[PDB]
Amino acid sequence: VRDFGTTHSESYKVPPHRVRRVCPASQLAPRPPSVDGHYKLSVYAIPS
Amino acid sequence: TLHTISSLDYGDGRTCVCRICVCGKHRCTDPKLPFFGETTYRDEYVPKSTVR
C-alpha cells in the first residue's frame, strides 16, 4: 500500500502550463498621435 | 478585462490607446504647445511713413 512518495517528489512537480495575456497596448504598434495628442486607433482592430 | 466596444469608442469608430491599456503601464499625455513669441524690435519698429 506504500506510495513511495518522497518529500522532493511531492513538493516539487512539473509546473502547470498557463498563458499570460499582456495588455493590447503593448501588442499594438505605435503611431504618431492625432491633433488632440491621444493615439487613436480603430475600435474593430483591438487585439487580445 | 476589456470593456464593451461602445464604451471604448469615441463615437466615430476610433478609440485611444489609454483606454485599451488595462495594465496602465502605457501613457498618451503628449499634447502640443506652440512657440508664442515676438521681440520688441520687430513689434514696435514697423515700417512707417507720414505726409510732409
CA distances from A40 to A15, B4, B11, B28, B49 (A): 40, 17, 12, 10, 53
Say if the Cβ atoms of A28 and B16 lie within 8 Å. Answer: no
Q: What SS3 string covers B5-52?
A: HHHHCCCCCEEEHHHHCCCCCCCCCCCCCCCCCCCHHHHHCCCCCCCC
What the block records as the C-alpha cell of B38 is 515676438
Closest Cβ opposite residue B14 in set A26, A37, A40: A40
Sign of CA dihedral A41, A46, B20, A25: negative
For residues B14 and A44, give the distance between their C-alpha atoms in angstroms, rounded to a whole number.
Answer: 8
Sort B28 into a burial class: Cβ within 10 Å, 0-12 / 13-18 / 19+. Answer: middle
Strand, helix or coil for residue A20? coil
Sort B17 into a burial class: Cβ within 10 Å, 0-12 / 13-18 / 19+. Answer: buried
Resolution of the coordinates, Å? 2.8
For residues A25 and A45, give the distance between their C-alpha atoms in angstroms, rounded to a whole number.
Answer: 12
By what technique were these coordinates determined? cryo-EM
Closest Cβ opposite residue B17 in set A35, A41, A43: A41
Report which of B15, B26, B8 is spatially closest to residue A34, judged by C-alpha positions: B15
Contact at 8 Å (CB) between B2 and A46?
Answer: yes
What the block records as the C-alpha cell of B13 is 469608430
